[PDB]
RNA sequence: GGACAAAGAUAAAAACACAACGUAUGGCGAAACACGUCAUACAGAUCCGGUAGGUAGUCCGGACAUAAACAGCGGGCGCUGUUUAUAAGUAACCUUCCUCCUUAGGUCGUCCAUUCUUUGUC
């Protein structure tokens, strides 16, 4: 019954403002106190900011003090969180939650929001490049081989991989993206194969990239002798 | 002065069944106003224990918190699959709040040695002038492994990034990729290419190479 | 028997009123702060002298203590010094004397002084 639903999140350059709601349902905001909670990709939770109940008092973490301020509108029972000054160590999923009730909860954060991505980077949208990682023609002959797709130079996240359409998902890691120094993602599909399958078996891997509108399917195989 | 909560460890393994427990240890007093939270892989955070001994309405009883001077440990009598998450702490005794930096509970498993192997540039690749040699870790446990790339025996550094796979639901176990990135020209300057990669399971340090523009 | 006088013992003794607005801690209110409310504590009735015979929590003077403001020194904080405050009120009322602050200012007064003992001289 109780929830809390976070909106307003999105792609925004560096030194750019971004504006965060936070919509609430099954309570009444004004009888909380509201948390800002962040965590960047593949790093740990971060109280961002919090909104204290009847007074209005608003409390920020160093790394937000000055450029961030979080509101409350009781009228249509959302938190707001305004950036200002935005910048890369700033990208994150931003959580909003509800502290309990002190009787209750005392002052645990017992709702939380799915959360909102927010990404400050100046990349430009861009489709992914697909290349053969063709499979070794060393391969054991009756060995196991390992074949993958390179999804490479694109941006934002994400990309999704199949391979053969879908039919073959047994033996494939579809590796996390790494964002490197260019600010493009990348990211590499593998499946291990019987050797024996090399020259009779059509592999495929079947990338898209919705963000670029790109579809693109890159059949791998071994190449000359 | 912010209040520092320090959580250990970052990562623990345990199996099905056993007694697990993680401390937050507080720079300053923070009273009892301390706080353990679930987060499993792209979820929210559950609150599981607040006031630092008291269990959230609903959280199962294998849960408990335990208070001692500036120390507060989490604990669960028995581990169950759907036990298996990142914990985290916090302080709420004054602002600005603090989170532990987390503690990831993963399944335990016999150690499996990491099959190697190593993929060339793509010609398309070539072709766009860039190269990327990508080197595989597949299937090992645990989780801790080094990879080290050596281009006509000369180590590199900082041209090299890495990514791993969460932990598999059948093999319970990891899987690596070191993507090594070099001009087509720098490319075209060396001939052999190697990942050397070390491991628990390994008894000695396993090395894939290709020699560059070959079958 | 009485009178005057000194020296003792003993007793007595001042009207009216005397203020938590506020602060601190804690509990509660849908409540980390703010706010509302409740509980408890906090307002120099300290010490010494004097007020002309005596009687002072409140008069007069000094000391100490506590609080605030300000000045200075040292490396928001600490120390030092000075000033002020510590109820309203010895205001108001009754009341004597004095002064052209006279439609005022100061000043005498407002309470108690009982009972008994010794000695000196008529
Ligand atoms: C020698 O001892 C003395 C001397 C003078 C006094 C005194 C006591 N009281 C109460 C008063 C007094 C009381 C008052 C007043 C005036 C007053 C004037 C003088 C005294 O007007 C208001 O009430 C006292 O006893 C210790
Ligand atoms: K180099
Ligand atoms: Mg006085
Ligand atoms: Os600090
Ligand atoms: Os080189």
């Known amino acids: 019954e109780v929830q809390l639903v976070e909106s307003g999140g999105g792609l925004v350059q560096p030194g750019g403002s971004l504006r965060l709601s936070c919509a609430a349902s099954?309570?009444?905001?004004?009888?909380?106190?509201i948390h800002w909670v962040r965590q960047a990709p593949g790093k740990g939770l971060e109280w961002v900011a919090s909104?204290?109940?009847?007074?209005?008092?608003?409390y920020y973490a160093d790394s937000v003090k000055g450029r961030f301020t979080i509101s409350a509108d009781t009228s249509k029972n959302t938190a707001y969180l305004q950036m200002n000054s935005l910048r890369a160590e700033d990208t994150a999923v931003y959580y909003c939650?509800?502290?309990?009730?002190?009787?209750?909860?005392?002052?645990?954060?017992?709702?939380w929001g799915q959360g909102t991505l927010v990404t400050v980077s100046s990349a430009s949208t861009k489709g992914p490049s697909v290349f053969p990682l063709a499979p070794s023609s060393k391969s054991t002959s009756g060995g196991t081989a390992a074949l993958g797709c390179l999804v490479k130079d694109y941006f934002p996240e994400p990309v999704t991989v199949s391979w053969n359409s879908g039919a073959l998902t047994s033996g494939v890691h579809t590796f996390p993206a790494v964002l490197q120094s260019s600010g493009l993602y990348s990211l590499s599909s593998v499946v291990t194969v019987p050797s024996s399958s090399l020259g009779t078996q059509t592999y495929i891997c079947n990338v898209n990239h919705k963000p670029s509108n790109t579809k693109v399917d890159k059949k791998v195989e071994p190449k000359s002798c | 002065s912010d209040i520092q909560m320090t959580q250990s460890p970052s990562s623990l393994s345990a199996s099905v069944g056993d007694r697990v427990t993680i401390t937050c240890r507080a720079s300053?007093?923070?009273?009892?106003?301390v706080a353990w939270y679930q987060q499993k892989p792209g979820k929210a955070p559950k609150l599981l224990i607040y006031?630092?001994?008291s269990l959230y309405s609903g959280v199962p009883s294998r849960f408990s918190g335990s208070r001692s001077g500036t120390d507060f440990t989490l604990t669960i009598s028995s581990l169950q699959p759907e036990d298996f998450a990142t914990y985290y702490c916090?302080?709420?005794?004054?602002?600005?709040?603090?989170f532990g930096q987390g503690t990831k509970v993963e399944i335990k498993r016999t150690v499996a040695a990491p099959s190697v192997f190593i993929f060339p540039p793509s010609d398309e690749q070539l072709k766009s002038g860039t190269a990327s040699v990508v080197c595989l870790l597949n299937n090992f446990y645990p989780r801790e492994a080094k990879v080290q790339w050596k281009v006509d025996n000369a180590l590199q550094s900082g041209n090299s990034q890495e990514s791993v796979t969460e932990q598999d639901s059948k093999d319970s176990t990891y899987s690596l990729s070191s993507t090594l990135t070099l001009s087509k020209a720098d490319y075209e300057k060396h001939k052999v290419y190697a990942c050397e990669v070390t491991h628990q399971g390994l008894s000695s340090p396993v090395t894939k190479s290709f020699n560059r523009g070959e079958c």
């Open positions: 939650a509800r502290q309990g009730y002190r009787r209750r909860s005392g002052r645990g954060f017992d709702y």
């Open positions: 099954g309570f009444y905001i004004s009888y909380s106190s």
């Open positions: 909104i204290s109940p009847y007074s209005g008092s608003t």
């Open positions: 300053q007093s923070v009273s009892s106003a």
């Open positions: 006031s630092a001994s």
């Open positions: 916090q302080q709420s005794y004054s602002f600005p709040n603090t």
